Amino acid sequence: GQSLRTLQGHQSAVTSLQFNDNIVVSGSDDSTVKVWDIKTGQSLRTLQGHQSAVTSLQFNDNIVVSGSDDSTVKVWDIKTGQSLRTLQGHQSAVTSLQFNDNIVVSGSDDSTVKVWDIKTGQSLRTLQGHQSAVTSLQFNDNIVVSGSDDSTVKVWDIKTGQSLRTLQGHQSAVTSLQFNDNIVVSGSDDSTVKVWDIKTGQSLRTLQGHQSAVTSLQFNDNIVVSGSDDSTVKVWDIKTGQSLRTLQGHQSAVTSLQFNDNIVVSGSDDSTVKVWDIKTGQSLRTLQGHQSAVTSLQFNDNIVVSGSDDSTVKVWDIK
Amino acid sequence: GQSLRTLQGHQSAVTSLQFNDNIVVSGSDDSTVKVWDIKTGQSLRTLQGHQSAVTSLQFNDNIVVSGSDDSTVKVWDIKTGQSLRTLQGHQSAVTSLQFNDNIVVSGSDDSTVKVWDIKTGQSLRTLQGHQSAVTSLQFNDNIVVSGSDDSTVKVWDIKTGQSLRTLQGHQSAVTSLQFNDNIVVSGSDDSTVKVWDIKTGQSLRTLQGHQSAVTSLQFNDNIVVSGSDDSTVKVWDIKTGQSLRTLQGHQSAVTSLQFNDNIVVSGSDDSTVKVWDIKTGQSLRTLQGHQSAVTSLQFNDNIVVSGSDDSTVKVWDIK
Lengths: 319, 319
Prior knowledge:
The structure is a homodimer.
Chain A lengths: L2 E5 L6 E6 L3 E6 L4 E5 L5 E5 L6 E6 L3 E6 L4 E5 L5 E5 L6 E6 L3 E6 L4 E5 L5 E5 L6 E6 L3 E6 L4 E5 L5 E5 L6 E6 L3 E6 L4 E5 L5 E5 L6 E6 L3 E6 L4 E5 L5 E5 L6 E6 L3 E6 L4 E5 L5 E5 L6 E6 L3 E6 L4 E5 L2
Antiparallel strand pairs in A: 1-32, 2-3, 3-4, 4-5, 6-7, 7-8, 8-9, 10-11, 11-12, 12-13, 14-15, 15-16, 16-17, 18-19, 19-20, 20-21, 22-23, 23-24, 24-25, 26-27, 27-28, 28-29, 30-31, 31-32
PDB class: de novo protein
Keywords: Designer protein, polyoxometalate, POM, TEW, packing, DE novo protein
Assembly: dimeric
């Protein structure tokens, strides 16, 4: 659980990050995206262009796609660091995004989701229906799934731009979601996680247990893992809807999480990252070093990469 | 209940505002503070200097004091628009501030509160004790009262910098607070409002009823008025601790509120401002016009001034 290196360069809080075997890409309230060598910790490029905070990002081998409080999405050449195109259309901040080789999908405080051609920068569809800000989204080849401050999840036909169905049940804003070909899982300010049939729109299970808002979630075939403002992480049986175990140790809200078959990794407003055994619920390591809240994280077999309100990214030895 | 004028100029969301009989002062994610003529809607000055979003502000007839995600507080000459001094010392974003003619008090994501000489810009004391970000604060000539993501409220001796007492009881982050000579009133992500004896630190009443986080509050000698992510505003009897009435009408979270002896004014993620009769709980007017969430508001007897994620400030005829 040792800190390997600290990546310094951002002038304000890190809001988002992603990494692979070679590089880390971070977004910050300082309006920039930075690309780092993960082995040396050296910043390689600073992507300048956004007029206000970067809220979301994703990258592959060739490009970076970033969303910002300036209401735009930008596509970058990750090798040269130059802005390739700026996707304008949203009327307020972009809150979330995802892309593949053909399409960018963005969500905004303007209550819409927009689908863009990533090669031309042209908006293809505007998904209208939510009554307030879009907070979260995911998409595949066929559909887009969005969550909103209006407490609903909506399923859209990405080709026609039509709303297929609206999933109602949460009592306050949807904060997070994930789906596969059969199931949508959503988290909400109402402190619950809900499991939905994606084809019928029917809620199947309501996971009750958290004492305050759910901030983050992930699921697979058998289990759901959720993080909450109540400072805990909970592991749920997705079939029975029962709480399997509660992971206690953080001293304030859990802000982010990721898990695999063996390990849960959580980040918290208490400035730490914790590594947990998912089968037993036991904390294995507490990663201490950040000076303020952890905002984002990702891990693999060897390392954890975390971003913080202290403006740094840290790389950790997970063992 | 009509829109009188729309103040356009900010390039991203308005985060904070204050007004008097002549002037509106607004802060924005675009890193600027703008000063407007309230009667004509004309921007008079743009205060440029912060390197990232402005999170908080206050002004009087001579100066503006602003806090930013760039970790600084700046003091401005409101007539010339020039930066008088920059107050550096916090290690992460400034979240809250208040000043009088002698001192500035700031709260930060670095978990500290700092007291500054406003004439010289010199930090006088750093209040250390909270375990995570400070979210809210208020001070007078003797004491500072702070709320934190660590779920506590702390009372400080502003002359010595010593923590006098820690108010424990909330089960998650404190989001808002107000105090007078007798009591402290705090709101929390645990969905409750708590009333405390400020001299002894003892909790007197826990106001239970909201279904999700409390986002905003105000109180007088008789009543507490609270807003929540459950989309409602509640009026409470501060002596008995019972809910008097629930104001329903907003379609998503209430973000801000203010009240006087006759009227409650609330702002919401549903992009509207609502005016309510505080005695009957009846909504009187719904102010429609903003294109996305209302983030901040203030009102007097004649007008309401609102700021929004749509980057505008609007002035409304409250009648």
